[PDB]
Write an enzyme that holds these catalytic residues in place. Structure first.
Site, PDB file in Angstrom:
ATOM      1  N   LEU H  41      41.561  41.588  47.166  1.00 33.91           N
ATOM      2  CA  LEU H  41      41.348  42.149  45.677  1.00 33.91           C
ATOM      3  C   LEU H  41      40.274  41.273  45.042  1.00 33.91           C
ATOM      4  O   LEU H  41      39.687  40.368  46.183  1.00 33.91           O
ATOM      5  CB  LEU H  41      42.302  42.237  44.958  1.00 33.91           C
ATOM      6  CG  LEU H  41      43.011  43.580  44.717  1.00 33.91           C
ATOM      7  CD1 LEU H  41      44.374  43.509  43.874  1.00 33.91           C
ATOM      8  CD2 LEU H  41      42.114  44.737  44.544  1.00 33.91           C
ATOM      9  N   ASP H  42      39.679  41.283  44.001  1.00 34.93           N
ATOM     10  CA  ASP H  42      38.770  40.462  43.507  1.00 34.93           C
ATOM     11  C   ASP H  42      39.442  39.602  42.223  1.00 34.93           C
ATOM     12  O   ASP H  42      40.733  40.156  41.626  1.00 34.93           O
ATOM     13  CB  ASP H  42      37.728  41.324  42.966  1.00 34.93           C
ATOM     14  CG  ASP H  42      36.478  40.241  42.810  1.00 34.93           C
ATOM     15  OD1 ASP H  42      36.556  39.068  43.340  1.00 34.93           O
ATOM     16  OD2 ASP H  42      35.420  40.910  42.524  1.00 34.93           O
ATOM     17  N   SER H  43      38.800  38.810  41.714  1.00 34.49           N
ATOM     18  CA  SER H  43      39.414  38.172  40.453  1.00 34.49           C
ATOM     19  C   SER H  43      39.250  38.971  39.415  1.00 34.49           C
ATOM     20  O   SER H  43      40.114  39.123  38.395  1.00 34.49           O
ATOM     21  CB  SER H  43      38.531  36.989  40.193  1.00 34.49           C
ATOM     22  OG  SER H  43      37.002  37.158  40.435  1.00 34.49           O
TER      23      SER H  43
END
Ligand SMILES: *C(=O)CCCCCCCCCCCCC
Lengths: 128, 171, 79, 122, 62, 220, 111, 87, 177, 155, 65, 459
Positions: H41-43
């Site tokens: 995922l991403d931040s």
């Protein structure tokens, strides 16, 4: 474009709009590290003497006593009579006294002059 | 009871109830229930209390004060007569305060009794109130918290001097 | 004490305005990854809601019928 | 509300003010004008304890309505005829008041016309 | 003990303060002053019995 | 005091136009109502002001009970942006809130119509301040605006509350008290207006564009 | 006249009774909110009666029942004036407070 | 009002709202599934996940604790700590 | 700029906090959910456009311009959750949060109504006074000289002991007592 | 508590400033005392003059209500800047803009109310007429004095 | 019994509350319609408003000059 | 008046021959008996005062002060028996003897018909008060406070002695009844101006007047609890009583000579009230509140109208009771937390509910809530000052804000909010403290029922 936000006395500048937050110099890092170290030392002392099961009473705070002594018992030895203090004391000490004395003297002189000449309405005035 | 000459009241004139409908008003039924459930036991208890009071009777009297010579026939710095004159003056002062109170009570009673025609039907009470307030103000006003018979005498002497001088100007 | 949830596959965005906004984002070259989270809001008893005019005249039919029978009874009982 | 615009945006020489009225004698232009007559004597209307504002020229239907209201208790909804008579009489009095306003306006208009005619003639 | 709220909280205060009003308040002058009843043309007085005369004939508008 | 009341009702209504807390909206609503009471005192109609007090207490209290019911059913969530679609979920609160909003706006032959409209009937045909009359008419329109804002955002539309739904209003106390104040807000204005004695001369002879000013203002 | 004043001051005394009832308490009260709600409903009825009497007749009364303080000329007594305003505002407030207290005994149950 | 919560209930809740994410395959994630490590995922996606948590449980997680929750079990533990579950 | 774990805030943390508050304010302005989804995806695209930026001063300038944008585009009253600071019911129940040491001042007559609870309380106090000296002796030997540089606390290192300074974080009152 | 912990006079030499900053638990370059104008402030520091609402509402304080920490040098007007009192938190719009808008709205409303008072709104009707010489006896007029008889004629 | 809390679906409603709500809405609309049928004048007007322009000069007593 | 002096002076063998464990019980019992005996001074007549002999008399002004003093002594005995529990027995007996001597001096000061006897015991009240303050005060500043108090009083009051001896040589007598019947007007001269100043300045200092009040926020703080009771509840009222007695002879110069001093209070009661908005100390807050209330009393006395005099009497009695109760509450908090600063102990309603109720009721009586006698006195002074001049109502009304603005403030930071975490020695309220609060408050609320016994001699 967008209106720039300026600070006031009763409306300070936001933290996110402060340029000094974005300064990433090493001196600022040292300053924040020293501030965090001081805060951690004080917090450690407070919660070391606060979590003690033997202690029953008040965890006294030297900052509170320092503040009370500065607010009450340290005002006079650090006072020096100069032009600013004397003018502020004369302006705010005997100014309103003279003003209210003149106002009340004028009103009561006018009222007595009207009363003794039979001009003021004093028909049902029997409670004074 | 009280005396009706000091506290006057007109004889009342109550209209007869002449209804124009067939629905019974609850006021008459509630009134009949009021003299049934409330007035009868209250009157019985009061009758018993009145019988117990009539079993043991005793009296009390209204204190009467004779007239002592006032401050106008008192030698100055003669405390023996001035003390009695000042006591008489203070008793009179309290009596006049209650007289003005009685007239104020009369005026308020007239206003409440007359209702929506009070500013026409209460002319006599208003005139009596104005007269007694004028006389009280000319007798007792502007003396101070340390009032005495001598201050009242001085005020009266100044008022009569002013009246005589104003008469002399217009004569 | 014990709570039971519905199936997570039953929420679909088709027919709802979430389908319209997903198609608009696709036309703009984007996507909405959270449409299925609130697909429940436009599906079930929370769909087909009345408008202001529908909510203002709630119960108007029975009230008008009551007014009709009342005015008929007041017409008949006078004569 | 066109009279307000006529007085405020036009001129006030013709439009009558509502502060003092009338500025004309009632016998001017009215031969044998008769006065309004009360039905209620002041004594019976005084004993009825009417409001001094309500002590106007049409207190007779007011007294009738109050007698209906006192006599029809608790049936509180069947005195509509008497109050209809009362506010009909008050409507007639309001009609008389606006008639007097129009009479004052027309007399002031005649004053303006006559004064401009006499200024131009001489 | 089913409706003693209508007895202790209602009837006993009515008794107590009716005694208080009848035998300690109204015995003093001008304590309870009531607006005199309204008088209309056409009714009858209980206190002396006069029939008040009826009012003048209406010049009817309707 | 007429000028002060008109200023108060306009200021509070304009503040209530864009508010988002429901209790804040009802607070500004009752302050605007008090401004209208000040206005009708200022035009020598005190008995109309007292009748407006007795009329306004019913539906203002009832609106606050409905607001409290919605607050309790949504776990102390007072923001209006997190509620919606409560028309069918809470039918009795919906019905009472709709009737209260209609009475507050001045729907004919409800309780408010028996006082509030009459105030405007004396506000037009009297020797009043012109600016005060204009701003109290604008304030009346603003009351209509924020009442239907409350109705649309609180009741209509789609839900916005959290996923766990604990909607319930089946308690005898709440239902009974809301029912009592609903009967009051339906009939008490009629009862009191037909039961009080006339203490003044009512003003009824007026043109058609002054008679239907309040209803047209509310509709627009 | 006697029914009027008695019922009005009964309404007032009935309202002030539960304050003494809770102040003289020792135990845990068996649903004190129900007691207060019942008291206020009964006071609403007891004040509804003289409002009906005023509607029928038009009676306004003043009861200066307790003389308090005679400040020479001024006399201050415990005086209740009940006219159009007081007699038509008391029962509306009592009805509203009855509804508000029922809503409170539902709403504040966890307090 | 206010029905009680439980640990398996709140775990079912966080998983149930997690499989409704179009960036997450529901057949892969578990209760110890890292976002940028095990799920890629991403931040910003973690920020959106935390906002979904706030909009689901009705209380806002502070940012200084939002930057630390990296697995569904950590969110379960944080909600359990903040709501005092299993008395 | 005021944290118990770190002395300062990094650039990525500032960007994430800005994204959080901007999305919350946009949700406040965009009450309906589908409209909020449209503009939230637009904001996500706008944040993803400048994601792969390597010049630090350009990223800082973009951050400052985005802060100016956000401050121009605030809701005057944004949505606050009821228990968050500034909310409608924030710190409402703090009158009910009685500390547990008041239970030490209870009379024996009212202590007899809860025997098992006070037995458990006694054993909890016994555990605390048994572990306190172990906790403080762990605290002296863990931190470096000159005082701790951070407010973070060590856990229970050995077996059979408790983490240092645990009593006022375990026995804290519930949210709804 | 010992005598060297209380505040003292105004520091001038740098070593007294260093000892004062050590006393108040703050950095030497962060310690700025009040100016020596003889107003009794002494060596108490001049804090950045911000209210307690501006502090972090999520960081755990030693005093959670006051948002304060044990041992921190508190402000000279901390009893003024508590959360129950005057706040200095930033506003969405500018202070001068708020003052100008509020003053302009108040002045415009006052001027318009004055204009409306000068120019009233009325109805096109004559004055209300009351019988019996404008109710001379009912207005409190004395019956002994005879007034001027006025009368209203029909139209 | 009580109403169990549902999850992402329309909650359970008693027949009594919806019946009472519909009944009271119908009662309000019946009251409004009945009062507009009977009174019909407090909204539209009570008495005709004679505009001043149609009044002749004889009844106003205006002298012709 | 011998029936009250003799038992008061026999209280000393009672407290000096008692056992080491029953001094408090015996002293409290017999002082309560004397307080019950004190009610026989209510035999007041509408014209004449109650004259006992050539030496003592009591009109309707001195009677409420006497009843308040002899009611206040047992309250001090119950309050001051916890911080002296560990004290030596001989010093305990010396403290009780100081209290007994102070009461004896006060109750024969309020009844002296002759003015120099009034002065002699008005200054004999200095010695036990000063001894108590400088002996049983806690911190270092009790010595400076005692010096300030003693020297302000004596330096203000020696010209009063000179003027009184001049009156005795000129008029020929100092008896108050003779002076009531032999009073001559005072003409306009500089000698009469300084005569007025010498007669007034002692009571100006003891009232206290604004600008001469600097001894109050020290002596009211460093003193113990019983010292605080006498300092706030009798001695200020003793100065007011002396002012009422001696303003008789100073007519009609007062009609202009009171012109500055009224301003010195009319503005002064503003400024000191504002000080209570920014006070970090609870005892100092109560002391400055006392300054403001007594300045209002000063204005009421100086305008010399009947309504102002009855307002001053009611205000003095009510303020004495309320200030004593507030000092008791502050002393209880100081005993529990061992510090006097207001912000240290917060949120005490969660721990001490009944003491919070007493705090609320005391604060409500402080801000003149009707129908309490505080409001009666404040109201009557307001009516009289409105009769004096119109703009004075502004100087009243603003005060009517600021008073509440500190009183409820004093209610909040000591009782409301989140409690202090690290303070864990908050014991439950004793029966002694609650009994002290009830004995302070219930007479005040009962006096609200029948206030005509405290409305002065010209009621
Ligand atoms: C002239 O128009 C006389 C009427 C009073 C002044 C104008 C009032 C205008 C506002 C009220 C009517 C609104 C109609 C929609």
């Amino acid at each position: 474009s967008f209106p720039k936000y300026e600070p006031s006395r009763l409306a300070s500048l936001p933290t996110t709009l402060d340029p000094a937050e974005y300064d990433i110099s090493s001196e600022t890092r040292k300053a924040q590290a020293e501030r965090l170290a001081i805060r951690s030392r004080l917090k450690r002392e407070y919660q070391l003497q606060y979590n003690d099961p033997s202690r029953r009473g008040v965890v006294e705070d030297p900052a509170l006593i320092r503040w009370t002594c500065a607010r009450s018992a340290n005002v006079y030895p650090n006072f020096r009579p100069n032009t600013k203090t004397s003018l502020l004391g004369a302006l705010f000490g005997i100014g309103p006294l003279i003003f209210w004395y003149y106002v009340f003297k004028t009103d009561r002189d006018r009222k007595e002059k009207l009363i003794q000449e039979g001009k003021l309405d004093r028909t049902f005035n029997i409670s004074y | 009871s009280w005396d009706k000459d000091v506290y006057p009241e007109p004889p009342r004139r109550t209209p007869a109830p002449s209804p124009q409908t067939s629905l019974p008003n609850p006021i008459t039924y509630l009134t009949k229930a009021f003299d049934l459930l409330v007035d009868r036991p209250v009157t019985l208890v009061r009758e018993f209390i009145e019988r117990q009071h009539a079993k043991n009777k005793y009296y009390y009297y209204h204190r009467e004060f004779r007239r002592v010579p006032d401050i106008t026939e008192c030698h100055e710095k003669d405390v023996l007569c001035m003390f009695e004159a000042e006591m008489q003056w203070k008793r009179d002062y309290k009596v006049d305060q209650e007289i003005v109170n009685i007239i104020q009570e009369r005026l308020k009673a007239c206003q409440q009794r007359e209702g929506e025609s009070h500013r026409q039907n209460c002319a006599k009470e208003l005139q009596q109130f104005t007269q007694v307030v004028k006389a009280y103000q000319d007798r007792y006003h502007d003396l101070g918290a340390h009032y005495s018979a001598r201050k009242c005498l001085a005020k009266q002497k100044q008022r009569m001097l002013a009246e005589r001088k104003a008469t002399k100007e217009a004569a | 004490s014990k709570m039971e949830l519905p199936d997570y596959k039953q929420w679909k965005i088709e027919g709802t305005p979430l389908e319209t906004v997903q198609e608009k984002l696709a036309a703009r070259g984007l996507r909405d990854p959270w449409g299925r989270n609130e697909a429940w809001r436009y599906m079930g008893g929370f769909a087909n809601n009345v408008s202001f005019v529908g909510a203002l005249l709630k119960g108007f039919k029975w009230g008008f019928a009551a007014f009709v029978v009342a005015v008929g009874a007041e017409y008949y009982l006078e004569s | 509300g066109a009279h307000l615009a006529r007085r405020y945006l036009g001129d006030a020489s013709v439009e009558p003010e509502p502060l003092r009225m009338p500025t004309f004698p009632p016998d001017y232009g009215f031969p044998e004008r008769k006065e309004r007559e009360m039905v209620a004597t002041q004594q019976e209307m005084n004993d009825a304890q009417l409001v001094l504002q309500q002590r106007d020229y049409c207190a007779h239907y007011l007294i009738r309505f109050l007698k209906c209201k006192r006599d029809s208790f608790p049936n509180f909804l069947a005195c509509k005829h008497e109050q209809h008579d009362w506010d009909y009489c008050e409507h007639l009095d309001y009609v008389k008041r606006m008639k007097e306003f129009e009479r004052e306006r027309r007399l002031l208009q005649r004053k303006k016309r006559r004064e401009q005619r006499e200024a131009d003639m001489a | 003990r089913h409706s003693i709220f209508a007895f202790t909280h209602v009837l006993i205060p009515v008794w107590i303060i009716h005694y208080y009003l009848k035998y300690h308040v109204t015995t003093k002058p001008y304590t309870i002053v009531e607006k005199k009843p309204r008088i209309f043309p056409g009714d009858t007085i209980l206190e002396t019995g006069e029939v008040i005369p009826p009012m003048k004939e209406f010049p009817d508008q309707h | 005091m007429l000028c002060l009341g008109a200023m108060t009702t306009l200021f509070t209504a304009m503040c209530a136009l864009t508010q988002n807390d429901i209790k804040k909206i009802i607070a500004f609503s009752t302050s605007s109502q008090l401004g209208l009471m000040m206005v009708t005192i200022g035009i020598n109609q005190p008995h109309l002001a007292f009748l407006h007090i007795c009329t306004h207490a019913f539906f203002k209290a009832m609106l606050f009970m409905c607001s409290g019911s919605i607050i309790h059913s949504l776990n102390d969530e007072q923001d209006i942006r997190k509620m919606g679609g409560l028309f069918k979920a809470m039918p009795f609160t919906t019905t009472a809130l709709i009737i209260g909003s209609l009475a507050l706006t001045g729907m004919p032959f409800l309780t408010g119509f028996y006082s509030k409209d009459l105030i405007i009937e004396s506000a037009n045909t009297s020797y009043t301040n012109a600016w005060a009359l204009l701003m109290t008419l604008v304030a009346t329109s603003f009351t209509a605006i924020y009442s239907t804002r409350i109705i649309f955002f609180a009741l209509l539309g789609q839900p916005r509350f959290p996923t766990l739904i604990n909607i319930n209003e089946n308690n005898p106390f709440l239902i009974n008290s809301i029912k009592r104040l609903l009967i009051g807000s339906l009939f008490a204005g009629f009862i009191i207006s037909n039961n009080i004695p006339p203490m003044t001369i009512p003003q009824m002879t007026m043109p058609h564009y002054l008679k239907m000013t309040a209803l047209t203002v509310t509709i627009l | 006249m006697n029914l009027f004043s008695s019922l009005t001051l009964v309404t007032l005394i009935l309202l002030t009774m539960p304050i003494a009832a809770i102040n003289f308490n020792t135990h845990k009260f068996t649903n004190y909110p129900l007691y207060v709600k019942t008291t206020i409903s009964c006071a609403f009825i007891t004040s509804m009666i003289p409002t009906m009497m005023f509607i029928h007749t038009g009676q306004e009364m003043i009861i200066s029942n307790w003389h308090w303080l005679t400040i020479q000329t001024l006399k201050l007594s415990l005086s209740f004036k009940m006219d159009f305003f007081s007699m038509m505002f008391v029962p509306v407030a009592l009805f509203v407070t009855w509804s508000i207290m029922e809503f409170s005994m539902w709403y504040m149950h966890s307090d | 009002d206010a029905p009680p919560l439980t640990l398996e209930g709140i775990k079912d809740r966080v998983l149930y709202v997690l499989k409704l994410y179009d960036k997450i395959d529901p057949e892969k994630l578990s209760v110890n599934s890292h976002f940028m490590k095990d799920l890629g995922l991403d931040s910003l996606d973690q920020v959106e996940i935390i906002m979904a948590m706030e909009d689901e449980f009705g209380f806002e997680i502070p940012d200084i604790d939002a930057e630390k929750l990296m697995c569904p079990q950590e969110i379960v533990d944080y909600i359990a700590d903040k709501k005092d579950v299993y008395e | 700029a005021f944290l118990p774990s770190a002395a300062y805030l990094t650039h990525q943390q500032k960007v994430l906090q800005l994204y959080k508050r901007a999305l919350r304010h946009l949700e406040s302005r965009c009450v309906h959910r589908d409209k909020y989804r449209y503009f939230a995806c637009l904001l996500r695209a706008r944040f993803d456009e400048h994601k792969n930026e390597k010049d630090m001063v350009k990223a800082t300038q973009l951050l400052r311009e985005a802060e100016k944008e956000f401050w121009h585009g605030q809701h005057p009253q944004p949505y606050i959750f009821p228990e968050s600071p500034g909310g409608t019911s924030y710190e409402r129940y703090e009158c009910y949060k009685v500390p547990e040491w008041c239970l030490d001042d209870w009379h024996p007559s009212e202590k007899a109504m809860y025997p098992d609870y006070f037995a458990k309380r006694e054993q909890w106090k016994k555990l605390r006074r048994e572990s306190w000296e172990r906790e403080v002796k762990q605290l002296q030997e863990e931190t470096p000289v000159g005082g701790p540089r951070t407010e973070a606390l060590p856990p229970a290192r050995k077996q059979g002991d408790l983490p240092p300074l645990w009593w006022h974080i375990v026995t804290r009152p519930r949210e709804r007592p | 508590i010992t005598k060297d912990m209380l505040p003292g006079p105004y520091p001038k030499t740098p070593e007294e400033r260093a000892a004062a900053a050590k006393k108040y638990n703050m950095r030497v370059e962060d310690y700025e005392p009040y100016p020596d104008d003889g107003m009794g402030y002494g060596d108490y520091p001049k804090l950045p003059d911000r209210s307690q609402q501006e502090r972090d509402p999520w960081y755990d304080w030693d005093h959670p209500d006051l948002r304060l920490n044990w041992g921190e040098p508190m402000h000279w007007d901390l009893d003024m800047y508590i959360r129950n009192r005057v706040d200095t938190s930033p506003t969405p719009v500018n202070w001068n803009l708020m003052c100008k808008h509020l003053f302009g709205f108040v002045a415009f409303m006052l001027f318009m109310f004055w204009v409306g008072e000068t120019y009233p709104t009325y109805q096109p009707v004559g004055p209300k007429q009351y019988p019996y010489n404008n109710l001379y006896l009912e207005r409190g007029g004395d019956p002994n004095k005879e007034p001027e008889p006025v009368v209203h004629y029909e139209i | 019994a009580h109403i169990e809390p549902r999850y992402r679906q329309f909650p359970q409603l008693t027949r009594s509350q919806v019946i009472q709500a519909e009944f009271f809405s119908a009662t309000m609309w019946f009251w409004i319609l009945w009062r507009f049928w009977h009174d019909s004048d407090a909204v539209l007007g009570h008495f005709p408003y004679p505009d001043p322009s149609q009044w002749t000069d004889e009844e106003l007593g205006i002298p012709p000059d | 008046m011998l029936k009250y002096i003799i038992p008061t002076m026999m209280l000393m063998p009672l407290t000096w021959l008692s056992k080491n464990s029953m001094i408090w019980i015996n002293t409290t019992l017999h002082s309560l008996l004397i307080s019950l005996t004190s009610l026989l001074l209510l035999n007041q007549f509408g014209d004449n005062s109650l004259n006992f002999s050539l030496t003592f008399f009591s009109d309707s002004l001195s009677t409420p002060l006497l009843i308040l003093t002899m009611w206040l002594l047992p309250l001090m005995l119950m309050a001051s028996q916890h911080h002296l529990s560990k004290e030596n027995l001989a010093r305990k007996k010396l403290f009780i003897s100081m209290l007994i001597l102070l009461q004896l001096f006060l109750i024969m000061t309020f009844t002296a018909t002759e003015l120099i006897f009034f002065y002699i015991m008005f200054e004999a009240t200095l010695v036990p008060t000063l001894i108590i303050i400088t002996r049983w005060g806690n911190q270092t500043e009790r010595l400076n406070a005692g010096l300030y108090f003693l020297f302000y009083t004596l330096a203000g009051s020696l010209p009063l002695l000179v003027a009184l001896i001049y009156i005795q040589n000129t008029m020929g007598s100092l008896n108050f009844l003779i002076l009531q019947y032999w009073v001559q007007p005072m003409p306009n001269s500089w000698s009469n101006t300084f005569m007025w100043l010498a007669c007034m300045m002692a009571f100006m200092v003891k009232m206290p007047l604004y600008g001469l009040h600097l001894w109050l926020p020290k002596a009211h703080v460093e003193a113990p609890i019983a010292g605080s009771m006498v300092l706030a509840a009798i001695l200020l009222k003793l100065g007011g009583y002396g002012m009422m007695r001696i303003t008789l002879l100073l007519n009609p110069i007062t009609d202009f000579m009171a012109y500055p001093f009224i301003m010195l209070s009319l503005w002064g009661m503003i400024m000191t009230s504002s000080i209570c908005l920014r006070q970090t100390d609870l005892k100092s807050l109560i002391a400055y509140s006392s300054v403001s209330h007594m300045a209002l009393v000063i204005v009421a006395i100086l305008i010399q109208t009947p309504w102002s005099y009855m307002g001053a009497t009611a205000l003095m009695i009510a303020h004495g009771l309320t200030s004593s109760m507030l000092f008791c509450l502050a002393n209880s908090n100081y005993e529990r937390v061992h510090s006097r600063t207001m912000i240290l102990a917060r949120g005490l309603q969660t721990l001490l509910p009944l003491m919070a109720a007493w705090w609320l009721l005391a604060s409500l009586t402080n801000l003149a809530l009707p129908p309490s006698i505080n409001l009666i006195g404040e109201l009557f002074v307001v009516m009289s000052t409105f009769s004096w001049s119109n703009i004075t109502i502004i100087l009243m009304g603003l005060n009517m804000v600021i008073t509440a603005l500190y009183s409820l403030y004093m209610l909040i930071t000591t009782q409301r909010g989140k409690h202090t975490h690290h303070i864990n020695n908050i014991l439950p309220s004793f029966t002694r403290e609650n009994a002290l609060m009830s004995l302070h408050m219930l007479p005040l609320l009962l006096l609200s029922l029948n206030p005509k016994i405290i409305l002065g001699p010209l009621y």
